[PDB]
From Swiss-Prot, chain B:
Organism the protein comes from: Saccharomyces cerevisiae (strain ATCC 204508 / S288c) (Baker's yeast)
Family membership: Belongs to the AAA ATPase family.
Name of the gene: RPT3
Keyword line: Acetylation, ATP-binding, Cytoplasm, Isopeptide bond, Nucleotide-binding, Nucleus, Proteasome, Ubl conjugation
GO biological process: positive regulation of RNA polymerase II transcription preinitiation complex assembly; proteasome regulatory particle assembly; proteasome-mediated ubiquitin-dependent protein catabolic process; ubiquitin-dependent protein catabolic process
Functional note: The 26S proteasome is involved in the ATP-dependent degradation of ubiquitinated proteins. The regulatory (or ATPase) complex confers ATP dependency and substrate specificity to the 26S complex.
PTM note: N-acetylated by NAT3.
Residues of the full protein shown: 45 to 140 of 428
Protein name (Swiss-Prot/TrEMBL): 26S proteasome regulatory subunit 6B homolog
Main subcellular location: cytoplasm
GO CC annotations on file: cytoplasm; nucleus; proteasome complex; proteasome regulatory particle, base subcomplex
Source taxonomy: Eukaryota, Fungi, Dikarya, Ascomycota, Saccharomycotina
GO molecular function, one term: identical protein binding
Location(s), subcellular: Cytoplasm; Nucleus
Curated annotation (Swiss-Prot), chain C:
Name this polypeptide is given: 26S proteasome regulatory subunit RPN2
UniProt record similarity statement: Belongs to the proteasome subunit S1 family.
PC repeats: from-to residues: 150-183, 187-224, 229-263, 264-298, 300-333, 334-355
Assembly: Interacts with UBR1.
Post-translational modification: N-acetylated by NAT1.
Species in which this protein is naturally found: Saccharomyces cerevisiae (strain ATCC 204508 / S288c)
Note: Present with 4750 molecules/cell in log phase SD medium.
Role this protein plays: Acts as a regulatory subunit of the 26S proteasome which is involved in the ATP-dependent degradation of ubiquitinated proteins.
Domain of life according to the entry: Eukaryota
Swiss-Prot record, chain D:
Post-translational modification comment from the UniProt entry: N-acetylated by NAT1.
Function recorded in the entry: The 26S proteasome is involved in the ATP-dependent degradation of ubiquitinated proteins. The regulatory (or ATPase) complex confers ATP dependency and substrate specificity to the 26S complex.
Highest taxon of source: Eukaryota
Disulfide bonds: none
Protein name as catalogued: 26S proteasome subunit RPT4
Coiled-coil portions: none
Protein family: Belongs to the AAA ATPase family.
Source species of the chain: Saccharomyces cerevisiae (strain ATCC 204508 / S288c)
UniProtKB/Swiss-Prot annotation, chain G:
Gene: RPN11
Record's protein name: Ubiquitin carboxyl-terminal hydrolase RPN11
Other noteworthy facts: Present with 16400 molecules/cell in log phase SD medium.
Organism: Saccharomyces cerevisiae (strain ATCC 204508 / S288c) (Baker's yeast)
Keyword set, alphabetical order: Acetylation, Hydrolase, Metal-binding, Metalloprotease, Protease, Proteasome, Thiol protease, Ubl conjugation pathway, Zinc
Source taxon at top rank: Eukaryota
Residues annotated as binding Zn(2+): H92, H94, D105
Post-translational modification: N-acetylated by NAT3.
InterPro entries assigned to the protein according to its UniProt record, in alphabetical order: JAMM/MPN+_dom (IPR000555), JAMM_MPN+_peptidase_M67A (IPR050242), MPN (IPR037518), RPN11_C (IPR056263)
Domain MPN as annotated: residue spans: 10-145
EC number: 3.4.19.12
Domain statement: The JAMM motif is required for the deubiquitination and degradation of ubiquitinated substrates.
Motif interval(s): JAMM motif: 92-105
GO molecular-function term, one example from the UniProt record: proteasome binding
């Protein structure tokens, strides 16, 4: 029970997460992603997804 | 008797198990106080200030998608021991 | 009784830790002298006991009159030399240790350098080994900070024992024969105390000069690193020999407020005078722990308190209550280990519950 | 300078007696607390 | 190998125990981390040829087991 | 000046600063660090935001002798107006340990610099009372109880201590105890009942003693103390009245509900038992199945 | 070399934390500055005993926005009370972004480094602070020599060698560029601990007061009634329980935010209060008369 509440309070304390959608794949193993309320940001993929 | 004199040293060993048994009660008390402390922090976050969004749809059942009046759109984590049955209809929600 | 096994007689001498029973042992074998039975016990006594006991006994055997054959063995002199000889024949060098250090890690980062330097000393313990040293020569050479201390120090652990080569390994790296930096000069004294850890009355006489020369001065940075390794060196090499010269000499260094070298002084005092249960040691250590606001010096004093209280059991309950009641982080830290050392090597219910 | 500016809004909806829900003239909707300096009688739904 | 209590006579050695306490502490000073050198105790049967205090090489029987590595 | 002053809240920055100052002027053995107390006042709630040491001496031979620096106050006030706009001189602190009558005389001079009535805020540097160490006072004037001699004397203002939410977070987590400003479980609330009663016990004793020393030693009469303590007797409950009988109906109601709550928790722990008893039959079957299933595996290897 | 290029673990007192924080937050949004007074000892310890704020500026913190006439005037007081101690670094609050440093603050940093060889910068962001301790870090200049000749991580050695992040994103950016961060510690003497905590005089009054009885008829009445609605649902959960998977149990009969866990919780929490209330009531009546 202590670890569980501690885990949950931590999720809040992270800044936020957003939402986009992969528009294309580039050859440098990066992805162009359109972030839905803002603009598009092209960025190296995560270290646990490909 | 041989067993009986070997015993004497065994009985001391069982006594340290006795002391483990007294030690559990002292750990228990510490954890229980603290579970309530851990919970107090999360109440701080539940309460003011808050910023009002409108809840869209669940994308999981522990993580959702919302919109804000901030002018943006987020993915947010849903905190436990709150209703997950009243996020089905889109209704106003508050985000920290 | 006239016919008994002496293996078990030796059991009693070691456990109680008394030089009077040890002598009473060698009297029976002075009237029944065969050089084989007498030497055999002699070797077994050194191996098993502390150094502290053997020193007290030797004095007793020169007053009594004895064969010089026995006198060498219970100085603990030849016992060192056999172990080296074994380790010479049978040493084996790992390829996995050299490869990973070479290729991946760098001695340019302090924290990495130190870890590789810690390992090397343990791995190639016995006689000198130069296989690590000449291959990773630029890697050892490219250190900075107290990572350079670590490197020099490791020379001593690998070349452990050896009384006919153990002053020669440190000979160009010694103060007054080097001036490369303060780290090489002080870490060679730290190393010399590990070669001559256990036995080393002679290593004591040398390091004593280094202490009493630099007393009063640690207002130079050089002196502070040099003396740091010099005070650790003598505590290890004189560990359990009971010198009131060492204990007195290191109080100046401690009262001067030496930055890194007050921590060293505290440990070097308590090792020498360890298990004596000295009233003066316990008192002096405690007062200056409370007194110094430097955090290194308090920690060294707090641990060095523990060492005096080795084997006290019941008479260390006064100390333990004082250390734990204090609200200082360092006092409590060493306060636990007063409890470790008092009842060390046998169980105890009171000690296990308290901790 | 040390007193520092503020932002005007109005009660969207009274939720409690020490806590109010508002809409600000910056755009956004907040759920705010109320200081014990100011009156809660003079706070009513729709007031600046 | 480290030896906590030697079985030569079967009695505690003081030095052993000290070495381990100094090794385990290194938390605010990582340079101070060579202190296993009182703790390591050699493991080998080493003879004496009479009273010459020279090591004879000879053969002794061992009952079990044949190892494929010590290297 | 001020006629609005009921309570003085004190932040724990102020209490610690005063404490530090005593020990950084080297003034000890019942000598006095006196400093100015800074923050808003001319309000029912006085809040002290900050404090700083003033140069100060005392000679306990004659207390009509002391040293207070006239340059220093002006210079400090100018600086302090810059950092926060809250800060202005609203009194002076005394470092205790008690309220000396020597404290009037100082307060008399102190009125001139201040824009209000100065406060005499005692902060004790050695801890006291089941209640706070910190007790606040304001200079007022009144007629005695002998109907003769109008004496400027000191009116106790009660204290509870407060800090903004800015300061408070750092207080809560730096603390590394149980706290008398927060509480945990039932176990801590049994503690609280013993502590609260112990305070009554000690405090009653002071009242009786005071009554003794009036009729023995013959300290002058106070109808403020005697008058307040007259009220206590009429407020006093007694036994055998219909009121106590109404307490007992409520005690049955509350223990009965505590009985039903207890019964409920018997069914809850009776559940946990079951889950384990189910868990035990499933684990024991599959544990054994594995061993059997392994024998067949081994058997394939042996055969050729 | 001539240096050991090592950063101290920073001991911040009780007395200093609250002053830093109070001034940052009242003053925010607006960057503000002030010096830190302390004691230096060792090379691994630096004490932040006390602090004093220096006046506001809307041009942020610069070396051309500080008031040295004010610094002088304060040090003159500091001498007349006999509390004089040496400057041990400086503190500032950024107005709304995590602990990091901008260019302008590196210029301010650089001159404290010159004045006192070892000095720290403690940066308080009081509106991403919520535990009074988070989003507060100390920083210290890294030399340009340190990067190119790898004499940067001599501060990872002869200390704990751990760095605890409050902002992962923000610290890591300046960790190679223009600073090295090392973790912060807190301290107090026992005199301080007792003062900081306090013992309340109302702690003894609220112990010995049994609350109004109108609120108690309501308390018991409401609580016992509410546990009937969820008592019924506790049966429906366990109609089957021999089914596999914990989430599964909760999906069939709608055991989401479990009726076992909620109903128990209600039983423990009203129970705690009623035992304490009968206790307080019985204490007062027997005690007083």
């Amino acid at each position: 029970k202590v670890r569980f509440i501690k885990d949950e309070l931590r999720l809040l304390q992270e800044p936020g997460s957003y939402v986009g959608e992969v528009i294309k794949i580039v050859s440098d193993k990066k992805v162009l992603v359109k972030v839905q309320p803002e603009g598009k940001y092209i960025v190296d993929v995560a270290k646990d997804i490909n | 008797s041989d067993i009986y004199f070997k015993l004497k040293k065994l009985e001391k060993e069982y006594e340290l198990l006795t002391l483990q048994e007294d030690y559990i009660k002292d750990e228990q008390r510490h954890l229980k106080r603290e579970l309530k402390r851990a919970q107090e922090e999360v109440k701080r976050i539940q309460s003011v200030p808050l910023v009002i969004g409108q809840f869209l749809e669940p994308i999981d059942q522990n993580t959702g998608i919302v919109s804000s009046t901030t002018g943006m759109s987020y993915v947010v984590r849903i905190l436990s021991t709150l209703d997950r049955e009243l996020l089905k209809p889109s209704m106003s929600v508050a985000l920290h | 009784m006239p016919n008994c096994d002496y293996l078990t007689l030796n059991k009693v001498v070691v456990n109680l830790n008394d030089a009077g029973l040890a002598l009473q042992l060698f009297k029976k074998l002075k009237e029944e002298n065969d050089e084989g039975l007498s030497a055999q016990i002699a070797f077994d006594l050194v191996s098993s006991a502390s150094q502290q006991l053997l020193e007290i006994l030797v004095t007793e055997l020169t007053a009594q009159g004895y064969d010089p054959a026995l006198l060498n063995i219970l100085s603990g002199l030849p016992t060192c030399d056999y172990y080296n000889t074994f380790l010479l024949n049978n040493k084996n060098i790992d390829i996995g240790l050299l490869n990973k250090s070479k290729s991946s890690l760098d001695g340019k980062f302090s924290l990495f350098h130190t870890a590789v330097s810690v390992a090397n000393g343990f791995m190639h313990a016995g006689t000198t080994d130069n296989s690590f040293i000449k291959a990773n020569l630029p890697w050892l050479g490219k250190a900075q900070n107290w990572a350079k201390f670590t490197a020099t120090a490791s020379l001593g652990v690998i070349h452990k024992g050896n009384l006919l080569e153990g002053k020669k390994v440190m000979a160009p790296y010694l103060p007054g024969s080097r001036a490369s930096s303060r780290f090489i000069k002080g870490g060679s004294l730290y190393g010399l105390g590990l070669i001559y850890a256990g036995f080393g009355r002679d290593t004591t006489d040398y390091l004593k000069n280094i202490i009493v020369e630099n007393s009063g001065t640690s207002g130079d940075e050089d002196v502070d690193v040099l003396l740091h390794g010099a005070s650790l060196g003598i505590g290890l090499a004189a560990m359990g020999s009971a010198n009131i010269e060492v204990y007195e000499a290191l109080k100046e260094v401690l009262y001067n407020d030496s930055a890194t070298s007050g921590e060293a002084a505290a440990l070097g005092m308590g090792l020498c005078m360890l298990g004596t249960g000295k009233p003066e040691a316990i008192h002096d250590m405690f007062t200056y722990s409370q007194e110094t606001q430097h955090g290194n010096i308090t920690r060294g004093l707090a641990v060095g308190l523990a060492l005096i209280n080795y084997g006290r059991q019941e008479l260390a309950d006064d100390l333990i209550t004082k250390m734990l009641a204090s609200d200082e982080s360092l006092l409590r830290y060493g306060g636990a280990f007063t409890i470790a050392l008092a009842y060390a090597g046998t169980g105890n219910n009171s000690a296990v519950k308290r901790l | 300078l040390q007193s520092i500016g503020q932002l005007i809004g109005e009660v969207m909806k009274e939720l409690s007696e020490e806590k109010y829900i508002v809409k600000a003239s910056s755009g956004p909707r907040y759920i705010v607390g109320v200081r014990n300096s100011v009156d809660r009688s003079k706070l009513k739904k729709g007031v600046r | 190998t480290i030896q906590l209590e030697n079985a030569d006579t079967g009695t505690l050695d003081t030095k052993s125990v000290v070495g381990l306490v100094m090794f385990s502490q290194f938390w605010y000073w990582f340079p101070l981390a060579h202190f296993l050198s009182l703790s390591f105790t050699p493991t080998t049967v080493i003879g004496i040829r009479g009273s010459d205090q020279a090591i004879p090489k000879f053969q002794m029987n061992c009952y079990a087991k044949e190892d494929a590595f010590s290297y | 000046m001020s006629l609005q002053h009921e309570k003085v809240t004190i932040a724990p920055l102020v209490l610690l600063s005063a404490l530090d100052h005593y020990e950084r002027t080297q003034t000890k053995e019942n000598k006095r660090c006196v400093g100015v107390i800074l923050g808003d006042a001319n309000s029912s709630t006085i809040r002290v935001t900050n404090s700083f040491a003033l140069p100060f001496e005392e000679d306990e031979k004659n207390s009509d002798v002391w040293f207070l620096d006239h340059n220093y106050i002006e210079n400090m006030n100018e600086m302090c107006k810059k950092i926060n706009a809250k800060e202005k001189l609203i009194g002076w602190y005394h470092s205790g340990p008690k309220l000396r009558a020597s404290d009037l005389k100082i307060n008399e001079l102190f009125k001139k610099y201040t824009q209000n009535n100065p406060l005499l805020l005692i902060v004790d540097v050695k801890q006291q009372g089941v209640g706070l160490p910190t007790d606040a006072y304001v200079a007022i004037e009144q007629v005695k109880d002998d109907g003769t001699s109008t004496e400027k004397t000191f009116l106790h203002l009660p204290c509870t201590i407060e800090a903004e939410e800015a300061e408070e977070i750092g207080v809560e987590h730096l603390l590394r105890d149980v706290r008398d400003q927060a509480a945990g479980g039932l176990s801590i609330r049994l503690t609280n009942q013993l502590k609260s009663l112990k305070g009554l016990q000690s405090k009653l004793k002071d009242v009786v003693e005071y009554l003794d020393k009036v009729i023995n030693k013959e300290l002058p009469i106070n109808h403020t103390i005697l008058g307040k303590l007259q009220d206590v007797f009429n407020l006093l409950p007694n036994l055998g009245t219909p009121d106590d009988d109404e307490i007992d109906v409520e005690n049955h109601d509350r223990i009965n509900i505590s009985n039903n709550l207890q019964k409920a928790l018997t069914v809850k722990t009776n559940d946990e038992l079951m889950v384990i008893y189910i868990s035990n039959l499933v684990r024991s079957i599959i544990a054994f199945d594995d061993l059997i299933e392994n024998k067949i595996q081994n058997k394939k290897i042996q055969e050729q | 070399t001539g240096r050991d290029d090592t950063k101290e673990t920073v001991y911040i007192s009780s007395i200093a934390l609250l002053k830093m924080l109070k001034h940052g937050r009242a003053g925010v949004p607006m960057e503000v500055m002030g010096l830190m007074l302390g004691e230096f000892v060792d090379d691994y310890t630096v004490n932040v005993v006390d602090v004093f704020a220096m006046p506001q500026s809307g041009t942020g913190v610069s070396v051309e926005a500080v008031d040295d006439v004010f610094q002088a005037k304060m040090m003159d007081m500091l001498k007349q009370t006999g509390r004089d101690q040496m400057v041990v670094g400086w503190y500032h609050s950024h107005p709304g972004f995590g602990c990091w440093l901008s260019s302008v603050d590196v210029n301010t940093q650089k001159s404290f480094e010159q004045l006192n060889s070892r000095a720290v910068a403690v940066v308080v962001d009081p509106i991403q602070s919520v535990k009074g301790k988070v989003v507060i870090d100390a920083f210290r200049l890294i030399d340009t020599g340190a990067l190119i000749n790898n004499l940067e991580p001599r501060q990872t050695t002869s200390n704990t060698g751990l760095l605890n992040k409050a902002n992962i994103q923000a610290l890591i950016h300046g960790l190679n560029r223009h600073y090295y961060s090392l973790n912060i510690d807190y301290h107090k003497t026992a005199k301080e601990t007792k003062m900081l905590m306090n013992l309340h005089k109302e702690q003894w009054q609220s112990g010995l007061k049994m609350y109004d009885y109108e609120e108690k008829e309501e308390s018991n009445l409401a609580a016992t009634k509410s546990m009937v609605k969820i008592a019924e649902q506790y049966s429906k959960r366990i109609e089957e329980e021999k089914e596999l998977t914990e989430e599964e149990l909760k999906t069939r009969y709608v055991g989401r935010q479990d009726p076992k866990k909620h109903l128990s919780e209600t039983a423990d929490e009203t129970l705690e209060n009623n035992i304490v209330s009968v206790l307080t009531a019985g204490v007062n009546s027997v005690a007083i008369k």
